[PDB]
Amino acid sequence: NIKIFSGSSHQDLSQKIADRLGLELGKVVTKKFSNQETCVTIGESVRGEDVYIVQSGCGEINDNLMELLIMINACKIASASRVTAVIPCFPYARQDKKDKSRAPISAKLVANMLSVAGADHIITMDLHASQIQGFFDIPVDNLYAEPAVLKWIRENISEWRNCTIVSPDAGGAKRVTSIADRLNVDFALIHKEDRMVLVGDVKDRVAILVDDMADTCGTICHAADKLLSAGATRVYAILTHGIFSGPAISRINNACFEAVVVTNTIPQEDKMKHCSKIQVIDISMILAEAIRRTHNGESVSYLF
Amino acid sequence: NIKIFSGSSHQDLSQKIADRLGLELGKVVTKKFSNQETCVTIGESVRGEDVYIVQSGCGEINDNLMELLIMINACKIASASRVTAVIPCFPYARQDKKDKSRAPISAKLVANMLSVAGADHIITMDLHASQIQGFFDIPVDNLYAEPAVLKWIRENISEWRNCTIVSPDAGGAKRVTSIADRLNVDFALIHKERKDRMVLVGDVKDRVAILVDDMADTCGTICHAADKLLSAGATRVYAILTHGIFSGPAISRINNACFEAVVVTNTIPQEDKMKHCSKIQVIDISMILAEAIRRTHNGESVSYLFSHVP
Amino acid sequence: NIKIFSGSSHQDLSQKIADRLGLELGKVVTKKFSNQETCVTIGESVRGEDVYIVQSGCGEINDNLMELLIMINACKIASASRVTAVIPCFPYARQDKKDKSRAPISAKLVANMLSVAGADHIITMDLHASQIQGFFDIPVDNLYAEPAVLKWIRENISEWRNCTIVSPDAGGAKRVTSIADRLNVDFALIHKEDRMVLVGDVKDRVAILVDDMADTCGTICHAADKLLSAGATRVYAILTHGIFSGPAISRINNACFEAVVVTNTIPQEDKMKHCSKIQVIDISMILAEAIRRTHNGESVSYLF
Amino acid sequence: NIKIFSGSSHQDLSQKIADRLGLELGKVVTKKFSNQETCVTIGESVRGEDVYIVQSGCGEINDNLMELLIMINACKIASASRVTAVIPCFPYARQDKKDKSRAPISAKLVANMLSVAGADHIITMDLHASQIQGFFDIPVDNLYAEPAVLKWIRENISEWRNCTIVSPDAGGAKRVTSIADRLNVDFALIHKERKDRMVLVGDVKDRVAILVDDMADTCGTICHAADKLLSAGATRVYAILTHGIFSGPAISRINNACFEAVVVTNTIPQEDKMKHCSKIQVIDISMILAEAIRRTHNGESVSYLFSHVP
Amino acid sequence: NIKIFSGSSHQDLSQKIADRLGLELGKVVTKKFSNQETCVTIGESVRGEDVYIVQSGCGEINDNLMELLIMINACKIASASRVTAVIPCFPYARQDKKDKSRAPISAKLVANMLSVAGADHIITMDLHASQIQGFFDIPVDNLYAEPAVLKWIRENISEWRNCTIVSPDAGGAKRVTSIADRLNVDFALIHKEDRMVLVGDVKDRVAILVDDMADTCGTICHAADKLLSAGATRVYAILTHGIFSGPAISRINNACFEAVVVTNTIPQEDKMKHCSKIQVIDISMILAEAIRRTHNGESVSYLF
Amino acid sequence: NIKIFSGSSHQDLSQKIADRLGLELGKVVTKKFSNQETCVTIGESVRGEDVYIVQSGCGEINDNLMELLIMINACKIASASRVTAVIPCFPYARQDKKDKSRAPISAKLVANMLSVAGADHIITMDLHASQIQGFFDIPVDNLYAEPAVLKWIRENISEWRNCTIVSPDAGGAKRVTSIADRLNVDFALIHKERKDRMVLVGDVKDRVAILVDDMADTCGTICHAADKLLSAGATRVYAILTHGIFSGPAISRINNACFEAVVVTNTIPQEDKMKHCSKIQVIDISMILAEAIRRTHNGESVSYLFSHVP
């Protein structure tokens, strides 16, 4: 009944999921033509099957998005009973408002695209905005790394009981204040005027920077600077989604980060070799369980 | 080509918007039936016209919403060329997300109902979350009162060069900072750690502190923020809200609270609330709205109003 | 699998339904904020469940309609298998045509609204117009009170065998002539020119006024007048939907109605205390059975 | 900007409507293939034009319907600015409800097919049920022949001040009463209690009786109503129908029936049926239709025609 | 669970299907009113049933199309679980492109119509164009007569091993070259300049004309001429869909066709009496099996 | 009213189309983020304008597609009166059918994505299958390079009166014949019977042979067709393609192949490929595209361009 398919060569996360469910990933022929067009074809009958497509990681987002849409379609016109897009890291999630410009609302495009391509359900993790669930008309199950982060903090930061959870920017206030609350410790916040202002006490205490995403690590590196200048004992950076493109990896080592935690919503094995302070939290049991429960009609809200 | 209609009988804002465009409100026979059903009937041809329906400030939100939808539907099947909803205060806006709960995204529902009833355009003001623009597939012009607020501050708060722009919650951070940076002043941020206390970040000592939020309902939060701000060395406290809801004990909570003044736009009618509250000052947003309609209809840039008070 | 939720505090009808099916109504937190906004949240997992929301009665129709739409939505994005709106009394059912004006077709609005909010199916009773079923694209099961009315007439009106079933207005012709037929007795009809014209024989015989709805009872009171003037022995008024707002209750006692039957599609317990000629027909076994059969794939057309 | 096209070759009404607007029918190459498939091909640019397709009275309803849809689809993908269907007689209208049965709502289906094929507007006449306007989400201008009927009565029936306007069924009650009240005359109502008799309510004694229905198909009902009316003391009987279908034995049933006259609009072509039937008189509804198109295109009030024969 | 309904009186094909599945065709009342309107009503409860409507054959295509749409609708608002339109011969399939004119794309109209009327799935045979599957958003299972044709050719044409599969027009190139390939024999092609040009060798060998459709048989008759002129030993004509309207039947006998094969996607029993060279291939086991497999969640792609 | 925007920075075709209409390309801030996400931001009001977005020839199809969609979406919510996609070469066109496989109809998907992102019109050139026009419900103007190709042949191939127009595959038959008939010359057709040989039908002996296909990607097919054609007595071989893709070893395969010349339109930028390939000649299709936009906007017949090179 249930059938798990993967996206790009990124096959690690989808393989870890298929394991926890006692399945083999479905057979698919997936490639690019010489002239850049994505070519996919399902290697088995999916008729009347509850079908999961776990988004791929070969960096190239437009390539990954299209191959996702093509698989979702492939499956829909081949009479799969239901198709869930499993997108730990929601593409274009940061382009969710105009922001006073004549810019597009790209997350609403992507959302539309996933739906018209035929997705019946979405399973994602830590949406850059909670209102992105409102971009769809189909059910979205938005998972949190929150508990997996807390566990780690407690289990890895000796002084956590008197640490400060700091946000990279002004928009992150809500996310850090919740983590500050569950732990019962101080929060603070940074804001690029440039010059970086910090509000809240971080003197003589551990300072964990929490952000949902890192991309160039420009803001997150600087943030760590400023946190030293304001006399934080040590500075950690916890990012649910670790994208680390461009100069990121070298900017990280170069910074004072005691460590930089990520989830494996994005493949990290390559960047680890080039960065020793990186550590991963496995999110495959969280996605596997959300798949098993989405299938069975059992609750998912627990995992939250 | 242009035609403006009001909802209900809270017609002040409607009529001011119409005055400023040189127009009379369109004729509407609108009443509530014995069983609470709303009735509407366009007292005039709207065939091939560019129609605007302005959302009423009566108070009863579900009544008010049904009426808006009904007039939209009324005009569409009457062959209006285009129907715009002018909803200065967006209903169910504070309901834009699931919040770890098994709860509706009421705003996306309302978004949806506005769409199917036949709206082509929306013109709203200071959406509780910008992301609500993504709840539609039609265009949305989301206006800001920021410019007006800045103008109000500059011209009424002597110390505005040395003040502190404050968020009464964690969600409102970008909004304050954005004003802070423009006036080239400091910002502070109040977080409440529920049961049942509030924590302040950012220096407010010996400064004037201005509470800025997008909307104030019962005013339980802001009153407690006026106290915490004073406790932390604030010379005095201002509260500026774009949407003046002031339901339940709000008016009481305000007359008691240590606010120097509470300012609100007229996105929701205040005239009555003022009579019981001498702290309340009112920014007139009909010049913003009218101009937005005027531009919408002509094909002129509305973006001009995002930073520049007409 | 099946789950019944209620609307407003009106909890009597939905409780009667849940009983006949051997269920407890689902847990929900339903209220109004100080500033009039409806706030609902489902108190249990509805994932993969056939979900019934029985419309509420706290008079205020826009309040009741919205809380209905919000529950239908709540349920849809929480991955309920199917959501049926159970609306004995269809809101705005009288606003189903323009009627030569620039008026809205409100029943088509509401219909659209129920569908976009996510209803998969509608179970209703005595639609003010049969063509309101054509306002949807989803299945509608429209139930009749017809048989429950006939039974009552026969069982309560000694002279029924030679009575006359009269209509309040010209539009009711079809509904009364069917009831006149099943019983094999005379029909007649009234029409406000005002002055009220009556066509058809009512001299020396019982005269039962049948209408689908009563609101102020202005037309129905007058109708009874005229029926006396034309020498009806006694005058009954049978209304499937008893709304009785405004002066209705006092207009009723004040009138010669031997009695005024209603169904309990609307709560009547409060108006009964203020009106002794009122009697109710319980429609909960009809709605309960339509729910059980809609669930099971068994026929509903019988109940008709 | 305006362009009018006809369906099939029943082009009288089409051509009269075009004459009255000062236009020639657009060029259409329309034929039926060997296997019964319909072909259409717009013999001219319609790019950015305000197109009207008038529904043909050929007779074969499914043929006729497909053709209408095809021309609509043909014009839409050809970038017509707007496509209006002018369907004087709405197909499958008598199929607007389920009627306690497991039957289709064919009218809502047709409604749906008209929509997806790309119609933006409908202009129809005397919908069997007004509620069919709720089968669309696009605008519908539903025209009445009432005004014309009133005008026909006044000027041809000497006793119209003392007559009785009759419904041949229970469904047609509002329609008669509405005419009754306007002419300030009495109304009667015939109900048939199937097997197999008819029952009359309302005095018709020593009065002229006018049967008014929206459409007459085989005329089995109306003929039996002419007899029952005469039986109940009617001086004489008129039958007025907005849609003259007259299929099967209708023409026979009519020449035999005790009608003084049978009147019908030309919403469906009668010229041929007339030759075999000298009782048939024909109200010309092309001035109504043309005016409705003319207003539609200009942005003028169509409602003017609901009570006032142009 | 499964329920098969038929279209017009054409009841042979649908009866053959219902047999192979061990079912009786569903009860339906289907007629035309005196004024040409199609009147249908389902004679049984279809609630929660997987419903198949096998398109009818009473020649009149607009009549057949509408009665199809009406049945699909009837079923949808009566709460059938799923409705599959079974359309061996897709109506208006030749009107699938503009072709440089301001002509409609009728196959896209019909496709839209089937979908809005409520079809969830389509089972068809030899679509005039494969891209007609792209006219829908619902699954389409397009079956081939290809294998049934090959079998017949091999089993009926002694010299087939050295025969030539010829196409009537230039557009048929793809269809004939595939049949030429599976058999490993020559193909050729004809094209009306009129004067008919033939490309490819047909001298001294059997020449089978393959087309998806025949209508007047004007092109197919002429084609056979030309094939004689170019010295084909014998000429067969294989048409998946045999419509044969107008002068066709007389044009066929009058031509040199050794024989003219068809499928029974259209009723042929009447034209056989008037044409002895006609032979039919039964496609009912192919449609019956596609129905049984579409129901069961078992593969259909095999049949291909 | 009219406004033209380019995608990416492959702005030659865009700029030529704009030059020919007397317009400057609209202002666009378009860049790729660090994580490969595309950004777009319309540097100017498009409110109530008739906008055209021209598809870029960068190369990376999924990048290019996302960008197009994004600009479409960007303009729609910015209240553009109408948004047209001008996609000289339609992405995923060769993916229009299932081909007996469990494969996507990528073209119908792309069709769908173009629709939901908010396109009102498409203007494309030589769709791989005409049937792709049926993947939309909006209008599509599908242009032909046939006229230009005919004009190129007539004026560069001396023997064009005696030549043979060839299809490199079975699918391309109608396309060649259509050119064959117009020039009143013969046609031939190459079929490949995969593993691994090609079979020719139609006399090419002692004639000039012109390979005509709609697109050429790696050129593996056409090179092998140049050889087979020469083998079968062709004086010499021309290859004409409307869409010059030339990826992978194409440029190599071409310099080696016995083509007298390879011709392509500039639907995809060739300037760079030319420098490495002296066989490549380039038909300029911006006069066709501009004219198509010019007509689209005015309401003039585009069909004029289907047979007549402006």
Domains and their CATH numbers in chain D: 1-144+284-304 (3.40.50.2020), 145-283 (3.40.50.2020)
Report whether A284 contacts A17 (CB < 8 A): yes
Cα R_g (chain F), whole angstroms: 20
Residue with tokens 């069909």: F303
Q: Taking the CB of residue F170, how many other CB atoms lie within 10 A of it? A: 23
DSSP D26: P
Q: Output the furthest CA–CA distance in chain E (Å, rounded).
A: 61
Q: Taking the CB of residue D43, how many other CB atoms lie within 10 A of it? A: 12
Would you call F193 helix, strand, or coil by DSSP?
strand
Pairing of strands C164-167, A28-32: unpaired
Distance from CA of B141 to the nearest CA of C (A): 23
| CA separation for the pair F72, F56 (Å, rounded) | 13
Q: Which of residues 15-74 of C touch A (CB under 8 A)?
A: 45, 47-49
| CA separation for the pair A123, A296 (Å, rounded) | 15
CB contact under 8 A, C105 and D133: yes
Report whether F99 contacts F87 (CB < 8 A): no
CB contact under 8 A, A245 and F218: no
Report whether E67 contacts D40 (CB < 8 A): no
Q: What are phi and psi of E147, to 5 degrees?
A: -70, -35
Closest CA to B244 of B221, B214, B212: B214
Distance from CA of F51 to the nearest CA of D (A): 16
**Token pair of E280 as six digits:** 């039919």
| CA separation for the pair F232, F205 (Å, rounded) | 6
Chains C and F touch (3+ CB pairs under 8 A): no
Known binding residue F99? Answer is yes
| CA separation for the pair D12, D267 (Å, rounded) | 10
- Reduced to 3 DSSP states, what percent helix, strand and coil does chain F have, rounded to the nearest 5? 35, 25, 40
> Is residue F249 packed enough to be buried (19+ CB in 10 Å), middle (13-18) or exposed (0-12)?
middle
**Chain E residue nearest residue D245, CA to CA:** E35
Q: What are phi and psi of E167, to 5 degrees?
A: -100, 135
| CA separation for the pair E245, E58 (Å, rounded) | 12
Distance from CA of A105 to the nearest CA of F (A): 7
| CA separation for the pair F22, D154 (Å, rounded) | 65
CB contact under 8 A, D47 and F121: no
DSSP output for D92-112: TGGG-S-TTSS---HHHHHHH
DSSP F48: T
Q: Which residues contact C282 (CB under 8 A, 6 or more apart)?
A: C16, C263, C264
Would you call C205 helix, strand, or coil by DSSP?
coil
**Chain D residue nearest residue E117, CA to CA:** D109
Pairing of strands A235-242, A207-214: parallel
Report whether B245 contacts B270 (CB < 8 A): no
Report whether B272 contacts B292 (CB < 8 A): no
Q: Which residues contact F166 (CB under 8 A, 6 or more apart)?
A: F176, F187, F188, F189, F190, F202, F204, F209, F210, F211, F212, F225, F229
| CA separation for the pair F170, F186 (Å, rounded) | 16
- Report the residue from E131, E188, E304 with minimal CB separation from F201: E188
**Chain C residue nearest residue D179, CA to CA:** C193
Helix (H) or strand (E) holding B49: none
CB contact under 8 A, D139 and B77: yes
Q: Taking the CB of residue C162, how many other CB atoms lie within 10 A of it? A: 11
B302 CB neighbours in chain F (<8 A) are 47
Q: Which residues contact D31 (CB under 8 A, 6 or more apart)?
A: D38, D39
Pairing of strands D2-6, C278-281: unpaired
Q: Which residues contact E41 (CB under 8 A, 6 or more apart)?
A: D101, D102, D103, D104, E28, E29, E74
- Report the residue from D45, D112, D247 with minimal CB separation from E35: D247
Report whether F309 contacts F288 (CB < 8 A): yes
Closest CA to E119 of E134, E140, E105: E140
E-assigned strand segments in chain F: 2-6, 31-32, 38-39, 50-54, 82-87, 121-125, 140-143, 164-167, 186-193, 197-201, 208-216, 236-244, 259-265, 280-283
| CA separation for the pair A64, A127 (Å, rounded) | 18
DSSP output for chain A: -EEEEE-SS--HHHHHHHHHTT-PPPPEEEEE-TTS-EEEEESS--TT-EEEEE---SS-HHHHHHHHHHHHHHHHHTT-SEEEEEESS-TTTT--S--SSS---HHHHHHHHHHHHT-SEEEEES-SSGGGGGG-SS-EEEE-SHHHHHHHHHHH-TTGGG-EEEESSGGGHHHHHHHHHHHT-EEEEEEE---EEEES--TTS-EEEEEEEESS-HHHHHHHHHHHHTT-S-EEEEEEEE--TTTHHHHHHTS--SEEEEESSS--HHHHTT-TTEEEE--HHHHHHHHHHHHHT--SGGG-
Strands lying side by side in the sheet with E196-199: E196-199, E186-192, E164-167, E207-214, E235-242, E259-263, E278-281
Would you call C17 helix, strand, or coil by DSSP?
helix
| CA separation for the pair B124, B135 (Å, rounded) | 13
- Report the residue from C107, C200, C304 with minimal CB separation from D134: C107
Report whether A262 contacts A280 (CB < 8 A): yes
Closest CA to D142 of D153, D155, D128: D128
The one-letter amino acid at A158:
S
Known binding residue E50? Answer is no
| CA separation for the pair A117, A138 (Å, rounded) | 12
Q: Taking the CB of residue C264, how many other CB atoms lie within 10 A of it? A: 18
Report whether B265 contacts B145 (CB < 8 A): yes
DSSP output for A17-58: HHHHTT-PPPPEEEEE-TTS-EEEEESS--TT-EEEEE---S
DSSP output for B247-288: -TTHHHHHHHS-EEEEEEEBTS--HHHHHT-TTEEEE--HHH
**Chain E residue nearest residue A81, CA to CA:** E297
Q: Which residues in E158-189 are b (16+ Cβ under 10 Å) and which e?
A: eebeebbbbbbbbbbbebbbbbbeebebbbbb
CB pairs under 8 A between B and F: 23
Method of determination is X-ray
- The secondary structure of F115-176, three-state, reads HHCCCCEEEEECCCCHHHHHHCCCCEEEECCHHHHHHHHHHHCCCCCCCEEEECCCCCHHHH
- Cα dihedral A149→A155→A157→A161 (10° resolution): 90
**Token pair of B268 as six digits:** 């929701």
The Cβ-side half-sphere exposure at F294, using a 13 Å CA radius, reads: 16
> After which residues does chain D break, using C–N > 2.5 Å?
195
Q: Which residues contact D287 (CB under 8 A, 6 or more apart)?
A: D20, D309, D310
Q: Which residues contact F63 (CB under 8 A, 6 or more apart)?
A: A62, A63, F8, F32, F38
B295 CB neighbours in chain F (<8 A) are 47
CB contact under 8 A, F133 and D77: yes
**Token pair of E119 as six digits:** 């079809």
Report whether C143 contacts C126 (CB < 8 A): yes
Helix (H) or strand (E) holding C245: none
F81 CB neighbours in chain B (<8 A) are 299
| CA separation for the pair A140, A161 (Å, rounded) | 35
Give alpha helix (H) positions in chain C. 12-20, 61-77, 106-117, 146-156, 173-183, 218-229, 248-253, 269-272, 284-296
> After which residues does chain C break, using C–N > 2.5 Å?
193
Residue with tokens 């009170």: C145
> Is residue F91 packed enough to be buried (19+ CB in 10 Å), middle (13-18) or exposed (0-12)?
buried
| CA separation for the pair C177, C174 (Å, rounded) | 5
Residue with tokens 């407010």: B204
Q: Taking the CB of residue D178, how many other CB atoms lie within 10 A of it? A: 16
Would you call E4 helix, strand, or coil by DSSP?
strand
On whether any CB of chain B is under 8 Å from the CB of C137, the answer is no
Pairing of strands F186-193, F197-201: antiparallel
Report whether E44 contacts E26 (CB < 8 A): yes
Q: What are phi and psi of A88, to 5 degrees?
A: -45, -55
- Report the residue from D133, D137, D299 with minimal CB separation from B47: D299
Chains A and E touch (3+ CB pairs under 8 A): yes
CB contact under 8 A, D301 and B48: no
Residue A256's alpha-carbon distances to A55, A163, F285, in angstroms, are 33, 17, 57
Closest CA to E94 of E249, E267, E228, E211: E211
CA angle, residues E121, E126, E128, in degrees to nearest 5: 100
Pairing of strands F82-87, F50-54: parallel
